[PDB]
């Protein structure tokens with residue numbers, strides 16, 4: 178698997194400074210790399226893709242670069258609203274992997290963001306991911322696990338059109354992906370839950386991450 182080593186877990190900066198967050202792929206990943214911004218209680222917002230193309234709406238402050246192995250995300254004049262988590266994504270080959278992330282800081286009320294469920298150990302859970310506003314069958318749906326202080330993990334994806342699926346070997350026996358064309362809803366069923374399965378589970382379309390769902394196993 179391709180490991181993406183992100184240069185610092187924590188980065189201190191100040192409003193007005195220039196910042197550089199880097200990711201080093203352990204194998205060549207071409208220019209298939211994306212950078213995301215994630216604020217607490219929110220979901221990743223795509224900033225750069227194909228390593229250097231700025232996504233629509235993202236302010237010039239952000240710039241991406243690199244090809245093959247060393248990727249960089251630079252913010253020319255850091256602003257307050259920029260203080261967040263940033264992580265890189267590699268989509269050159271399976272399993273898709275992510276850099277453990279970088280928290281950009283200097284040195285708010287949050288309620289049910291996201292909502293979720295508390296289930297029992299050894300039990301099973303089936304998470305939903307309703308889609309709206311676009312042709313469900315035309316875009317892969319990915320599922321990602323996020324624990325609080327660790328790096329994002331990609332579970333697998335599925336093409337709703339024919340339900341073709343890819344699994345990160347690590348989740349092969351824990352997750353099973355399905356979709357329901359009739360209600361444009363993708364699902365993920367986790368089996369034999371342990372405290373290790375407690376996390377926020379996101380489903381994502383290229384450029385649109387869901388709000389996620391908190392699965393607590395107690």
Ligand SMILES: CC1(C)S[C@@H]2[C@H](NC(=O)[C@H](N)c3ccccc3)C(=O)N2[C@H]1C(=O)O
Pocket residue numbers: 211268273317318319320321331334381382383384
């Ligand atoms: C080669 C691919 C992996 S890239 C594309 C889409 N990838 C995304 O939606 C997006 N980058 C994404 C968001 C969140 C987590 C992981 C990935 C996806 O899955 N498709 C595959 C395909 O077309 O063969």
